[PDB]
Every structure is written in structure tokens, then in C-alpha cells.
Amino acid sequence: KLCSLDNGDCDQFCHEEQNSVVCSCARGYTLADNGKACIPTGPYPCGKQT
Amino acid sequence: IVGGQECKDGECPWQALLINEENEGFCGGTILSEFYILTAAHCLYQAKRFKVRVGDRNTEQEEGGEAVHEVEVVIKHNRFTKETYDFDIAVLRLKTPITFRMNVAPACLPERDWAESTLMTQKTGIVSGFGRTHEKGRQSTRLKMLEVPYVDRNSCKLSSSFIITQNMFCAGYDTKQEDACQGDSGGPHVTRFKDTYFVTGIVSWGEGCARKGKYGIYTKVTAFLKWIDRSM
Numbered sequence A: 001k002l003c004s005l006d007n008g009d010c011d012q013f014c015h016e017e018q019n020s021v022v023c024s025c026a027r028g029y030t031l032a033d034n035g036k037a038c039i040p041t042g043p044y045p046c047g048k049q050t
Numbered sequence B: 001i002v003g004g005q006e007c008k009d010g011e012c013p014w015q016a017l018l019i020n021e022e023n024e025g026f027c028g029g030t031i032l033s034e035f036y037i038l039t040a041a042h043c044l045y046q047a048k049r050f051k052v053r054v055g056d057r058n059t060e061q062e063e064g065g066e067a068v069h070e071v072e073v074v075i076k077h078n079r080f081t082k083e084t085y086d087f088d089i090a091v092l093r094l095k096t097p098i099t100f101r102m103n104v105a106p107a108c109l110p111e112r113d114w115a116e117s118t119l120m121t122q123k124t125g126i127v128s129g130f131g132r133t134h135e136k137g138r139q140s141t142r143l144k145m146l147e148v149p150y151v152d153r154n155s156c157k158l159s160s161s162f163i164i165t166q167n168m169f170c171a172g173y174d175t176k177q178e179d180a181c182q183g184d185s186g187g188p189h190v191t192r193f194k195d196t197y198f199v200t201g202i203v204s205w206g207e208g209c210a211r212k213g214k215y216g217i218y219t220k221v222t223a224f225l226k227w228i229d230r231s232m
């Protein structure tokens, strides 16, 4: 149920492991300190307009 | 693309155009990385030999930002057949890498179970291409895009006497005259999630274009994420 509302507050991917939200990101992104946001790791990250 | 609108600068940067031996665009593709383009398996049977153009916005004019890449290898799905159009997916490895720049950037690959549950359940996606602007119409010299609603599975299956499989999905309109069309084949269907675009479909087939009670059929990318990863 954890990812069913507001995507678990994740910017990108949301999963549930041992009854807690785990966020993750696409290749070329890294998880921010807060464990929710996805920060590009370089120029021209995937899925962004130029 | 039937209806919709022209892509603005920066807007559709993952669009690729497959060009045949006569230099005519005949299918689209989606940039996945510096070396790999996603397209439809059926596109491979439209031209013996072809190349891939990126950064193209206007097919009749030189821009100074567009580039043509030759294909090193074609990776076609083993289970595609012309009889079913099932497994309509291929990956192209380019001979020389793409330099990402204005109007040239990759779409994100989604993550399977998350995308099935959260991305495919969005109201709409966006399809883009240089294909015909109506059934029997001329191709577009300008890159176009169109917002298309996801169609529920039962309405989808009932729309055709052809078998629409679990590896396909429908998007578009019942009667509104907007759809993808011939020449958009192989191109991107993307879905936005929180300001990031994920490639969710490959333009595959329709019964004509924009017909009443007919939808666009797309290869379901989530059904092939491991296959794509292995191919790349």
C-alpha cells in the first residue's frame, strides 16, 4: 500500500521492502540525501527536454 | 501524426528518423543512449538498408544540428511475425556514438513493475513522428507530437478482429480525428511522470489512421525491459 498514494513521495521509482518505502532512480540519476529526489549525475540526463 | 502540433525546440529530443536508400524517412525510433536506438521490428522490412537521423526537425532543410548515423547491428526480437505483429521491437546499435546536444537526448527506460502500476495508469502519453498527417495523407516535413489517452484493455481488445496481445496496448481516441499514422511506426510513445519522460511504447500498427472505433496499437515497452537491457 505504501507506493499507492503519492508514489511514496519518490521522484521516480517506488518500491516497498520490509514494510518501508524505498525510492530509486533511472540510470544517470542519483538519489538525494533525503532518499526521495532524483538528481542528474551528468549533462543530458534521460527523459529531460533540452 | 494526424492532428496534434509541431514539436517546439527542445521538446522531443529522443526522436530518431530512419531513412532508406533513397534518403526518405520511413519510420521513427527512440534514442536510448549514445549507441542505441529503439524501434519496431516491422520497420526492418520496409527498407533493405537504412541509416538513422537525429536532431532533425525539418526534413526538407539542412539545420546544422542534425546528424546521420550508420547502423552497426540490428537486434530484432526472435518472436516477431508479420502475421501477428506481436513482439514488434528491435534495437539498433550505431557505428558512431551520438553527441547529446540541443534536440538530441535519450528517453528514460522505465522500471517494470513500478511502471505497470504507476506509469501505464496515467491518463495520457505523447506520440511523435514525421509520418502521414492523415490516412492517405502526405508525410509531415516537420516533427509533430500528439497527446493520446491510454485506452482501457476491454475497449482495446474489442476494437479489432486482429488479436491485440499482452505485449501491446491501445492509445488514442474513439472518434476524434487524432492518431499516429504510417511513417510514425517505430517511434516514441512517452509518458511523463513528475517532469521526466519515460519511453512506454513503440508505434506499431493501426487499422488505417484515426478511424472511428479504432485506436493506435503500441508495443508495450515494460514487457521488454529485460530484453532491451540484454540487447544493450
Ligand SMILES: O=C([C@H](O)CS(=O)(=O)c1ccc2cc(Cl)ccc2c1)N1CCC(N2CCCNC2=O)CC1
Pocket (backbone or CB within 6 Å): B082, B083, B084, B085, B162, B179, B180, B181, B182, B183, B184, B185, B203, B204, B205, B206, B207, B208, B209, B210, B215, B216, B217, B218
Ligand atoms: O493498416 C495497417 C497499417 O498499420 C496502417 S498504417 O501504416 O497507416 C499505420 C501504422 C502504424 C500505426 C501506429 C499507430 Cl500507434 C496508429 C496508427 C498506425 C497506422 N495494417 C493492416 C493491419 C496489419 N496487421 C496488424 C495486426 C496483425 N496482422 C496484420 O496484418 C498491420 C498493417
Ligand SMILES: [Ca+2]
Pocket (backbone or CB within 6 Å): B056, B057, B058, B059, B060, B061, B062, B063, B066
Ligand atoms: Ca533537416
Ligand SMILES: [Ca+2]
Pocket (backbone or CB within 6 Å): A015, B111, B112, B113, B114
Ligand atoms: Ca520493481
Ligand SMILES: [Ca+2]
Pocket (backbone or CB within 6 Å): B172, B173, B174, B175, B176, B210, B211, B212, B213, B214, B215
Ligand atoms: Ca479512432
